[PDB]
Design a binder for this molecule. Structure first.
Ligand SMILES: [Mn+2]
Ligand SMILES: [Mn+2]
Ligand SMILES: [Mn+2]
Ligand SMILES: [Mn+2]
Lengths: 205, 205
């Protein structure tokens, strides 16, 4: 029984989207004696997080409306580290991908220590498939699940079929295969996302 | 397989320590058409959270040094909702509490939906016993594990023997007995605590 921690470290200087200074977290501390107490400011879309429909809608469901039963369940890691530029319907047709599947995608982003602007992303063609195939949720090892797609069709195509999106996974030391996924978000209410601790278990039970 | 969410909701207006209005979380939201994006600010000791040795020491370990192997593991939920004022050595001698047990304390705090200044707490006599018995960790259904104790002897007795302190649990709907605990902290580096999503499973094997 090994736990693989596939969560991104949160710290000032961490890889953030487009390396934008304002997307960086701040931690303030105070030590009155031996008592050390901190406060953290962070974008909900920081490192390992779970997107909610409200991101890409407006009467969109929040983080809260997505049940823990959908996040603390079995999952399948798909190795797409052979993929260049973007994941296409081709790369996900040939994989074991059924209805109510939670698929985590290990791509060459798992191996970038700093932000890469040309990160492998889930194209609309790939997402529209995944939606009509009837997957439960998709995780990507990238802070955003899509780029170079204005009107955000990838995102919109998942959250339309209430498919939970997990961004910011660190899947370097993970082998393609089925695992017990623990995707535990901060119990934030009414928001477009929540930062998450995502663990894999080799439970094989 | 039933998950029990024993994590407090995080929202402006939530119960915080002594109702200090500065300990309240903040959130800023932005809406370019249908993209919605948020930023949270919160005390790392807000609601359900894991304490680190740093709080109550300085050479003491930060919230990245408590491994997930001792936070995502079998737990014992002990009923002490018959206890008044404070938990004592007598109150934790009678219970099936063993070395390397992770013990979550259900008390009258779970049935308090607002902060109460007279909260049940773990007293030094009890925290010392649990320290020399060799428990792996103790969870409390109060935002703080002690009060009316200057020098913080309960904290220190436990963070001294690398015993983990988990605070802010919501154990009203939780029957005394064994569970699988997922105490999944936000992966913030070099801090005195980190907010946690704590889940309880009934897998029993
Ligand atoms: Mn995002
Ligand atoms: Mn997104
Ligand atoms: Mn605390
Ligand atoms: Mn504390």
């Amino acid at each position: 029984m090994k736990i693989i921690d596939i969560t991104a470290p949160i710290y000032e200087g961490m890889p953030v989207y487009k390396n934008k200074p304002e997307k960086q977290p701040s931690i303030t501390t105070q030590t009155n004696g031996h008592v050390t107490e901190s406060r953290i400011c962070m974008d909900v879309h920081t490192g390992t997080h779970v997107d909610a429909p409200l991101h890409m809608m407006n009467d969109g469901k929040t983080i809260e409306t997505i049940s823990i039963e959908k996040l603390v369940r079995p999952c399948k890691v798909i190795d797409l580290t052979h993929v260049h530029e973007k994941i296409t319907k081709s790369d996900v047709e040939n994989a074991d991908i059924q209805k109510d599947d939670f698929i985590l995608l290990k791509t060459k982003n798992s191996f970038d220590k700093e932000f890469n602007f040309d990160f492998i992303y889930l194209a609309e063609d790939a997402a529209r498939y995944l939606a009509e195939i009837g997957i439960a949720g998709v995780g990507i090892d990238s802070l955003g699940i899509e780029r170079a797609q204005p009107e955000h069709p990838t995102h919109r195509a998942l959250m339309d079929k209430d498919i939970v999106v997990i961004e910011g996974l660190q899947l370097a030391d993970v082998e393609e295969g089925s695992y017990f996924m623990i995707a535990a978000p901060l119990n934030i209410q009414g928001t477009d996302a929540s930062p998450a601790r995502v663990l894999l278990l080799d439970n094989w039970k």
